[PDB]
Assembly symmetry: D2
Homo-oligomer: 283 residues x 4
């Protein structure tokens, strides 16, 4: 009596017709948000390039490839890059760019593939390991804790850490969720990786379950009239993440925290938008 019926199953497609909700308002306005990245900050570039040159890295794995913007730079700067993402929607933009530039030998040798953090061991050939593995742009926080024990968090980290060769580097960030939690507000335009050329009003929703933060949902609105879209994030605190990320290497690592590209010292006056963890695999 109350059952519903589909034209087609969730997840499938068909020639000649747009994929499910691919042409909706939300998906359209979101396509502008992810395209709002042709102003990478000079400060972000310098710091990441400086880091990788400083540690002598050549083979880099980017495990949160997205549209490919971090990976593209590294391709242009002569690294040997493998880029990997779980989301085909975003990966589409990276593959596209590679194709458009396929006649430059550097882009011809750029490796791009689907992989999931939770099955990364199987999804990616790592050999002895990569010189550096990167997970920037606050992407790790997209993985929620559905199981309730952060077991998916630990598995993802362990798998990501296991890509790093001995003496190699893991660079991984998250946004300053300590601040967001205590103020309830996630201010817009504070992306220090890329300067936004796109105006945003953002509503911030924090969900706390049994007295433990569980989820932060941002509702983005853009002018047109005006239309909105929504994304959600797990709010990692610095102290918890610091513990999780080291656990990932079974304690065998050197660890340090940057705040917006500079050394961080707890109780320092400057409250950074982002924490970046840098980990040298000690074995």
């Amino acid at each position: 009596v109350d059952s519903v019926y589909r034209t087609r199953s969730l997840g499938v497609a068909a020639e000649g017709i747009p994929d499910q909700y691919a042409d909706g308002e939300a998906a359209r306005v979101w396509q502008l948000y992810i395209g709002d990245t042709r102003s990478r900050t000079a400060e972000y570039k310098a710091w990441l390039l400086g880091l990788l040159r400083q540690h002598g890295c050549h083979r880099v794995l980017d495990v949160a490839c997205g549209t490919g913007v971090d990976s593209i730079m590294l391709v242009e700067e002569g690294f040997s890059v493998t880029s990997v993402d779980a989301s085909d929607k975003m990966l589409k933009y990276a593959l596209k760019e590679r194709w458009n530039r396929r006649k430059e030998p550097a882009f011809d040798k750029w490796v791009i593939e689907e992989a999931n953090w939770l099955t990364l061991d199987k999804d990616v050939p790592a050999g002895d390991g990569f010189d550096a593995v990167i997970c920037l742009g606050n992407s790790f926080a997209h993985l929620p804790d559905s199981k309730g024990d952060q077991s998916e968090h630990r598995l993802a980290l362990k798998n990501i850490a296991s890509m790093v060769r001995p003496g190699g580097l893991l660079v991984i960030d998250h946004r300053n969720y300590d601040y967001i939690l205590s103020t309830g507000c996630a201010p817009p335009g504070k992306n220090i990786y890329y300067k936004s050329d796109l105006t945003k009003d953002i509503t911030t929703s924090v969900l706390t379950v049994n007295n433990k933060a569980h989820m932060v949902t941002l509702d983005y609105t853009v002018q047109v009239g005006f239309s909105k879209f929504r994304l959600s994030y797990y709010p990692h605190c610095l102290a918890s993440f610091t513990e999780l990320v080291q656990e990932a290497f079974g304690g065998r690592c050197q660890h340090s925290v940057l705040g917006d590209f500079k050394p961080y010292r707890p109780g320092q006056a400057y409250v950074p938008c982002y924490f970046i963890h840098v980990l040298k695999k000690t074995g």
Copy 2:
């Protein structure tokens, strides 16, 4: 009081996480089905090759790329091929194949792009037009009649026809929906283009609205003592109605012939085809 909170908007994605329902069981078994194209029938290859060479076609536009398999065979045989689709999830497999074969010259020159029949005039620069436009595999039937008056079908076709050069070909097909509606059954594994390696039980559901056929929905089941399934819907074009529609798209200014499973179709013949293929030559 009754509203629902999402984690993320529909249609939206994020680094590190699989897209919506992309790892679902329905989507997995559906992947096997779209993948079931390893055995192109020799009859199909020989037929299309023959047809195109007959009319001197070099510039060919596939408006229903899908996984690229129709297009791939034309690349190999040395045509200049532009393939498009509205579907990124399927296009993915075409692109991927082109990437794997990019050291072969023909492959390098294969153009694959996003495009919708309803905006085709805008998504694709036809210049003067293509020698042959192809839309095979029963793909046209995937476009439903959301409005009741079949106006989308007419706009689609019209846009598809405008891609054909004066004196060029449109080759466009549909499954035999006269038989399916008549019997109430869509029997499985009769694909004439690619012999099925995969076994499926189909349940055929036909919706009729105010006594006009509106939709055929097939639920497919497979094994692996397993029992997973998935579902697709189609618009049941009868031969007479489609013949009218496809001509009107040209404004009557064409030579029309219909084939049934690759051979001439004579109404009232004993043989009942699985597919009707409409072959139009634009006047010019």
Copy 3:
């Protein structure tokens, strides 16, 4: 990642707030359709009253009570009435009317209770049985075949038939679904029980699964500016239903079919809007 979260579970309510979708367009236009019953046809009344008087019935069970319109008449004509429905939403209107007329002894005596055809043995005290059991207004067809084998149709009928005392009467109808299937159209205003005093444009959808009719969905459009609602039905053909209803009494019954209150002879010229089966329990 793709999970949704409710304010409240499906099915529950809370003081001070309207129940789920109780105030929506569809609900509101549907409330008008079910209220469109203050013109009972003279032909209906005379026939049913005529039938019950003729067979000497006093205790009647109405197993598709709805808003109570058929039962109300029977109360007013001095039968001892028990009225039963599975839907609380509709039952609310019957209870309401009883309450308003509680000071008339006949209404004070009227019995109104929730029961489901699939558990009617347990839900309704029948003793030796009722003199007559009625299921009019094409209500039976509201029970779909979700299991695929019509097993729910048989169970419902067996339970309904078991309420009838030996020598007693079952009166049960369905709409002429033979006609609706062959034409694809379910014309509006053809209700021979109650004259519609409300204009409705109707779209008719028929679903056939593996060559067997499975469902008829009517989408009703009603000005009051258009609001729409939708109900669905199982399309019982005469030959199948005649078999099903007799099976329900294990063959031990006299059976006859009426077409819009008059004898029906197969192949007769008049195509009726409704078939009414009349069954006398032969043991």
Copy 4:
């Protein structure tokens, strides 16, 4: 391409078939919870009775009838009672109880009707007004703030206050949401009106939007013949200070206001932390 076909519209019913999700597991366990009202506390009975008799109230309006239990006790004790609710699913149990007891004179004169706080002015003819208006059990918190500005809360309260005669009472309560927000926890079985016979595990979820408390959502797990089944309900977490302002504003300041905590006077900074706050307003007149 992506649309869905329903069998029937949402909100619509049909003879012979149960209403939408009415037989679901979540609805079945939820019925047990709304049914857990067999033991009215003696402290509650005594308190309300006293309060009303003190102000000479006879005509009493329950704007949150639910299953009727608050009203029933007033019918029995000889008041003239009008009970309403927006919810038919709950009102059903009130009506059914009145039907069963219809031979008792008091229950014959018990008026039970459909009405919404937001349209209360229209759904109920108040004439000159009622002697006491009651809205107890934390029912008011079921109304969410769909708009952001708390305007519906204000309209609702205003409407509720307009039902009170000059010099009449409004008695309206809320769970102690200061404590629930502060601790993040909504501990089970503290109902001060009806002692719980039913055991529940609660999970407490608090949503904050731009740093303002917006919703508290409780998931109750209840034991079954030994199995577990869940149902959910949501609430608006009214703090004491804000609600005290809101409930006064509804009268236009023209009232005497006092707040009780679990039936006893509340003095801010007292050691005892109440489970419920009960606001007692006397309209000036």
